[PDB]
Structure formats: C-alpha cells, structure tokens
C-alpha cells in the first residue's frame, strides 16, 4: 500500500493547522501571536509569527515525501516541560485500511474538521500544563530504513536526526482518545498521552 | 555516554565497526542508521576528535571493500553527518 502526492498534501495541510491549534490551546505560545482563521469550514487559530510558521512549514515539508509512500506510522507533537521532560503528546497514528467506506477526498472537510473540533475543546479533559513548556515534533517510521532519512533530508538548513529515549519516554502516562476516522484509503487516529502528575 | 551498541570506549567502537564491515556483505539498514546516530551524538556531546577518527576509519574500510554496498553506506552516513555539522558548527568535516 501507498498513499499519493495529494493525499500526502492533504495530510500535511491538516497537520499544519493542527499543530498550530495545539500550540494555541495548550498555551505553548501566548494567544497574542495567533489570529482566527477558517480551515475545513471551522474556526482555528494560526500563528502569525514568521519564524515559528517557517519551522512548522519546514517540518511538514520534510515529512511529506514519507507520507507519500505511506512510510509513517506516527507523527507526534511532543510538549516538553521547563526541564525538558515530556509532559504531554499529541499522536497522529496513521494506518492503511484494507470496500464500503467514505471517500477521503470527497469528504475531506467533514472528516478532518472533526479532529480540529476535538483539539479545540481538549483542555476540558487534559490537566493544565506547567509554565515554560516547549514543543518538538517526532516522526515514527513504519520501518527502520535508510530511505526515510534520504527522503526527509531535503532542506539543508533544516536537518533531522534519530531521536533517543530521552526525547520519548514519559513517566506514568495516561491516554485520552480524541478522534478516530476511517476512509477510502486512510485510517487516522488522534490521541493524547499526558503525564500523571504535571 | 555516546555508545555504539554498548561500545563506549573508542577502541570497542573501532573493533566492533571493523568486524562488522569485514564480516557482513549485506548490512542491515537498521545498523547503518545506528552508526549515523552514534556519529550525531558525538556531535551533540562535543567529541569532534572521535567522529573524525570514526569517519576516517570507516571511510578506509568501507571504501576498500569490494561491495558496492559499503561504498554507498559510507556516502549515506557522511551525508547525514555533514548536514548536522553544517548546522551545529557552521562547517562540514574535511574529507580528502
């Protein structure tokens, strides 16, 4: 199984909006840098800050070609506390379903807007994060394969490394499912892992 | 704190690499990737003397090998070390 270019484009647009929303609802950055916009016929908050925007843009631009060949199991937005321990994780787990489902492309907005709505109200079910949190994004490949690095390593200015245990391990995690969707060609699931005392 | 598969001491890394490139003619990608990682950890730990040694060592063995595969392996590892140096230090390693 492989996705296509456009499915991968769809997913990257989706993830850009999402990452912005997360950084907003979890006050990783202060509200003063955001502006109301509208994606998938619904209200979101997009950062205005050019450096931050370029970071998120760069990140996803690099993931794109691995989505193309369906080589990504998870994209993870990790929130790190002041001492750089992970406090919280937003996981987009991406599967290929093996036909009576909805068409992904015909129904894009209904299908993805559901994720966005859930991110908007998610602080209702998460514990507040401490002050000082930063973020990082992590890509979990299906395989440990050379080609993932070739494909990811497309902006000289914006290189990638393999992560360690430090970047990943969360103590005593609790799980909060947010949204699960199946389609034509794609099964995606968004769920949060938070630390049990933050 | 930077290790190849447990090998911390420079020479354990040396022997482990040597045996590895000298025994195997089709290396597991998963291993190649650990080498890259090991090298980028050397950069994050500020041990530039060691990566230069390692780089050179595996350049010599990898490129000396008859296998097309080790030659390509080296190229991959070095590429991925270079983009990281070029951003951590503003420079790429000198390779003659």
């Amino acid at each position: 199984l492989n996705f296509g270019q456009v499915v991968a484009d769809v997913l990257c647009e989706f993830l850009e909006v999402a990452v912005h929303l997360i950084l907003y609802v979890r006050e990783v950055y202060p509200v003063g840098i955001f502006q109301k916009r509208k994606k998938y016929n619904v209200p979101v908050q997009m950062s205005c800050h050019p450096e931050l925007n370029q970071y998120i843009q760069d990140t996803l631009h690099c993931v794109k070609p691995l989505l193309e060949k369906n080589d990504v199991e998870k994209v993870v937005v990790v929130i790190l506390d002041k001492e750089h321990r992970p406090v919280e994780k937003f996981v987009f787990e991406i599967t290929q379903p093996p036909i009576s489902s909805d068409s992904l492309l015909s129904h894009v907005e209904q299908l993805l807007a559901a994720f966005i709505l859930k991110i908007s109200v998610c602080d209702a079910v998460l514990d507040h994060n401490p002050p000082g949190c930063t973020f990082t994004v992590l890509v979990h490949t299906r395989e440990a394969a050379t080609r993932n690095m070739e494909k990811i390593q497309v902006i000289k200015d914006f290189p990638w490394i393999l992560a360690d245990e430090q970047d990943v391990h969360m103590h005593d995690p609790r799980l909060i499912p947010l949204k699960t969707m199946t389609s034509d060609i794609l099964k995606m699931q968004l769920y949060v892992e938070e630390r049990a005392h933050k | 704190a930077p290790n190849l598969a447990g090998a911390v001491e420079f020479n354990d890394v040396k022997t482990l690499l040597r045996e590895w490139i000298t025994t195997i003619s089709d290396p597991m990608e998963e291993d190649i990737l650990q080498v890259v990682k090991y090298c980028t950890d050397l950069i994050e730990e500020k041990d530039l003397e060691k990566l230069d040694l390692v780089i050179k060592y595996m350049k010599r063995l990898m490129q000396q090998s008859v296998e097309s595969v080790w030659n390509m392996a080296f190229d991959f590892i070095l590429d991925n070390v270079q983009v990281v140096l070029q951003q951590t230090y503003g420079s790429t390693l000198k390779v003659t």
């Binding site: 760069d58 990140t59 979990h140 490949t141 393999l162 | 990737l33």
Partner: peptide, 20 residues
C-alpha cells in the same frame, strides 16, 4: 530508536517570540 526521526532545530522559544 531507529525509526524515530526528529528535527535537529528547536522551534523558536517563548522568549524569542516576546519581541517580534
């Protein structure tokens, strides 16, 4: 592990933003 990739760069911090 061997199948997790992450950007070398940190995103711009909260501080670094307070002034732009």
């Amino acid at each position: 592990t061997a199948n997790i990739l992450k950007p070398l760069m940190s995103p711009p911090s909260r501080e670094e933003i307070m002034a732009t």
